[PDB]
Amino acid sequence: MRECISIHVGQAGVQIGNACWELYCLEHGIQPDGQMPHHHDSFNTFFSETGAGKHVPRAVFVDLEPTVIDEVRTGTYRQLFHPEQLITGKEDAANNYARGHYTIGKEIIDLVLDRIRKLADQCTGLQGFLVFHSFGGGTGSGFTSLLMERLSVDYGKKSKLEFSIYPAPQVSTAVVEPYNSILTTHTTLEHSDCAFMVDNEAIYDICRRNLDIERPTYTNLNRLISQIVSSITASLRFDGALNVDLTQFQTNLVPYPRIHFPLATYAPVISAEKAYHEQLSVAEITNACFEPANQMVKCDPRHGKYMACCLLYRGDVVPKDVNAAIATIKTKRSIQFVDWCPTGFKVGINYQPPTVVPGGDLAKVQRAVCMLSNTTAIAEAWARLDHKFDLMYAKRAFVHWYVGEGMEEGEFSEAREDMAALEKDYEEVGVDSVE
């Protein structure tokens, strides 16, 4: 009845999406082939119904380099996706934002838009867009800015949430990461309602320490991030004692037009052997999720102050001890909120316990918590990325690749002054002021 479409860009988006649609299909009791062996609508919001028993997702997989899509085409989930939806290019942007936004990215944007328009007109209660893209990648960063500009032009006012992958401070995979990230943030700063961040090693620390796995391939990392995404949407898909809508997330988490960069967190993340020796109480998972070491971004919240928080409990949850738990959290010393926000908690409860993917690293739990924190500890991460970009650009390194591919040094100057304005606003808002 209320519909939201999902756009996956780059290899990161496709690989995450493969793990995300892994779990949505499991949550709704749908076999991989589209058939089936609370339940009945729910699946109408994501899985459009064909006349037969087959369900097809509202997913738009787009990439320029075709090897990753050829994997998902030949994967186990071959019969689920609509064959028209999988859009492939011929060569990728090669970590060049200029290529992926000006030269080659403009020659396929018309095809993806037409598939978006066809899918949106198919639905009747369109709500918003879910974008799964990374930041370092040339096509992930290059395409997303083009799509945000194109989608916002077509649809005037709709919720536009993005599940990005924040670049790390010591873990690195590209060499032009400071160039791609700064360009991406500046262009999409005005066309993103709420963008979640995730750091790769932060899950690696979590997977190594909390769950004790010494072989965390990208499959295990994708499984953890996939769990956060579903339970955020699970309020729309499922009934609950206190339902929270996509606008409710967007309204309750964004205090300012520019400060719309929260971070995600999930709990409990414990293993199978340690499951027996734990009681899984509501009072402690509220404490466990809020613990600084469990945050899924490589930033310590103790270095800053929270500004707004949002909790989502699902399963056998009573609103009383949930009420009690937040009361003790608020009075605790380590947690400090900002002065202009005497109240900083939004609570949503759902009756559906989370499901477990077969063969997963996590253990079955009857209660789950997902925490979305908009804080100021993110500001220290922006300054660090700004420092890296300023160091590299100080002597015009790699600019010849960018300039030759349809840019000018003037555009780099404007993006630099833009991030200075965002950082100066973030610190001045977080810092206290008299009167």
Partner 1 sequence: MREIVHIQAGQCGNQIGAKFWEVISDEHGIDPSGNYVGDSDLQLERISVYYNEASSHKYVPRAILVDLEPGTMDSVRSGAFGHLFRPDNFIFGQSGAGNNWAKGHYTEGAELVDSVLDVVRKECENCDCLQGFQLTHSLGGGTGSGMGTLLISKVREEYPDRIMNTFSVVPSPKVSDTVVEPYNATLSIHQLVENTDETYCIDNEALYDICFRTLKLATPTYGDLNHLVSATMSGVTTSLRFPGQLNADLRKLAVNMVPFPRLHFFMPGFAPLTARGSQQYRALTVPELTQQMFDAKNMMAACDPRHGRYLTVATVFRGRMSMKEVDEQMLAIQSKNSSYFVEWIPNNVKVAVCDIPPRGLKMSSTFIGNSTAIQELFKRISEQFTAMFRRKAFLHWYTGEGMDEMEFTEAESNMNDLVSEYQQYQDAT
Ligand X SMILES: Nc1nc2c(ncn2[C@@H]2O[C@H](COP(=O)(O)OP(=O)(O)OP(=O)(O)O)[C@@H](O)[C@H]2O)c(=O)[nH]1
Q: Which of the residues 272 through 301 are near partner 1 (CB under 8 A)?
A: none
CA within 13 Å, CB half, 133: 36
Q: Does 26 bind partner 1 (CB under 8 A)?
A: no
From the CB of 374, what's the least distance to partner 1, in Å?
10
Q: Which of the residues 42 through 101 are near Mg ion (CB under 5 A)?
A: 65, 92
Among Mg ion, ligand X, partner 1, none, partner that 165 touches (CB below 5 to 8 angstroms by kind)? ligand X
Q: Does 344 bind partner 1 (CB under 8 A)?
A: yes
From the CB of 245, what's the least distance to its own copies, in Å?
27
Q: Does 434 bind its own copies (CB under 8 A)?
A: no
Write the CA distances from 380 to 72, 80, 112, integer angstroms.
37, 42, 36
Rg (alpha carbons) of the chain, rounded to whole number: 21
| Interface residue with partner 1, options 37, 39, 40, 83 (CB under 8 A) | 40
**Which residue lies nearer to Mg ion by CB, 3 or 92?**
92
**Which residue lies nearer to its own copies by CB, 119 or 228?**
119
Q: Does 123 bind partner 1 (CB under 8 A)?
A: no
* Dihedral sign computed on CA atoms, order 397, 403, 409, 411: negative
* Dihedral sign computed on CA atoms, order 68, 72, 73, 74: positive
| Interface residue with its own copies, options 50, 76, 172, 334 (CB under 8 A) | 50
**Which residue lies nearer to ligand X by CB, 46 or 97?**
97
From the CB of 5, what's the least distance to its own copies, in Å?
16
Q: How many CB atoms lie within 10 A of CB 191?
A: 16
**Which residue lies nearer to partner 1 by CB, 213 or 241?**
241
Q: Does 431 bind partner 1 (CB under 8 A)?
A: no
| Interface residue with its own copies, options 37, 83, 342, 359 (CB under 8 A) | 83
Q: Does 280 bind its own copies (CB under 8 A)?
A: yes
Calpha distance 164→121 (Å, rounded): 27
Longest CA–CA span in the chain (Å) reads 65
Q: Does 278 bind its own copies (CB under 8 A)?
A: yes
From the CB of 428, what's the least distance to ligand X, in Å?
31
**Which residue lies nearer to its own copies by CB, 240 or 353?**
353
From the CB of 86, what's the least distance to partner 1, in Å?
30
Calpha distance 228→231 (Å, rounded): 6
**Which residue lies nearer to ligand X by CB, 222 or 373?**
222
Q: Does 300 bind its own copies (CB under 8 A)?
A: no
From the CB of 349, what's the least distance to its own copies, in Å?
20
CB under 8 A: which stretch of 82-90, 189-197, 237-245, 308-316 binds its own copies? 82-90
| Interface residue with partner 1, options 102, 204, 345, 401 (CB under 8 A) | 345
Token code pair at residue 5:
């479409």
Q: Does 52 bind its own copies (CB under 8 A)?
A: yes
**Which residue lies nearer to partner 1 by CB, 241 or 275?**
241
From the CB of 35, what's the least distance to ligand X, in Å?
29
| Interface residue with Mg ion, options 3, 9, 11, 370 (CB under 5 A) | 11
Q: Are 181 and 167 in contact (CB under 8 A)?
A: yes
Token code pair at residue 297:
């971004």
CB under 8 A: which stretch of 244-252, 256-264, 274-282, 416-424 binds its own copies? 274-282
Interface residues with its own copies (CB under 8 A)? 49-52, 54, 56, 82-84, 121-122, 273-274, 276-280, 284, 287
Interface residues with partner 1 (CB under 8 A)? 1-2, 40, 125, 127, 236, 239-243, 245, 247-248, 250-257, 308, 318-321, 323-324, 326-327, 330, 339-347, 429, 433, 435
